[PDB]
Homo-oligomer: 77 residues x 2
Amino acid sequence: QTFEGAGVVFEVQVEKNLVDIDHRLYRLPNSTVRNGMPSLFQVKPGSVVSYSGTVSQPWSTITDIYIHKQMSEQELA
Amino acid sequence: EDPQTFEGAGVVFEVQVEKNLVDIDHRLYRLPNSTVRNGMPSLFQVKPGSVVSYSGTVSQPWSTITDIYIHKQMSEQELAEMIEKE
Ligand SMILES: [Cl-]
Ligand code: NA
């Protein structure tokens, strides 16, 4: 039922609530929020992330995601 | 590098909800009610024993955590699945 991982965002599809992390697709609903802002609009290609969620088919749902501030800057460079 | 922002990781040892303070690896940080994740203040989610990644702004007397994530060490890990496949 639950999972946790870490990786690098390669692509974000805001219109489909999907995020591509290390070539794996996850559902990233607007309900995954931090400081009143949906995380779907904060993650970008190159973001280094820690995430957790619930197992679902075909793609698992991320219900919590954190952007590594120093590592995402190093990844983009 | 921004000298006004900070980021770290550690273990929560104590939480003082009445003073908006969190003790991580015996250092103290301000954890205001405005640091919210999924509509809930993170101050009431962190507990002694929580493993955390956090970031914020340098401030006086304590630096302010504006973003904090609890590591789910008890959940099944994608890295474990990766090591099992490799
Ligand atoms: Cl929120
Ligand atoms: Na900084």
